[PDB]
From Swiss-Prot:
It comes from Bos taurus (Bovine). It is found in: Secreted. The keyword Secreted applies. One of its GO terms (biological process) is negative regulation of thrombin-activated receptor signaling pathway. The record marks K15, A16 as: Reactive bond for trypsin. It comes from the Eukaryota. This is Pancreatic trypsin inhibitor. The chain holds residues 36 to 93 of 100 of the full protein.
């Protein structure tokens, strides 16, 4: 599993409220979070299905 997948979500310093997805380590679910619009980390996806494709596999 890519080494960024089990990290907490990162809003960043931006002032936007873009609803992105992260893979939630504990639950094994794609979950929404508020993204500021800049300086993204890698556990940050445009869709639930993208989070699962990239992070969902052991």
């Amino acid at each position: 599993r890519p080494d960024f997948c089990l990290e907490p979500p990162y809003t960043g310093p931006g002032k936007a409220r873009i609803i992105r997805y992260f893979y939630n380590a504990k639950a094994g679910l794609a979950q929404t979070f508020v993204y500021g619009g800049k300086r993204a980390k890698r556990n940050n996806f445009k869709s639930a299905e993208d989070a699962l494709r990239t992070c969902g596999g052991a």
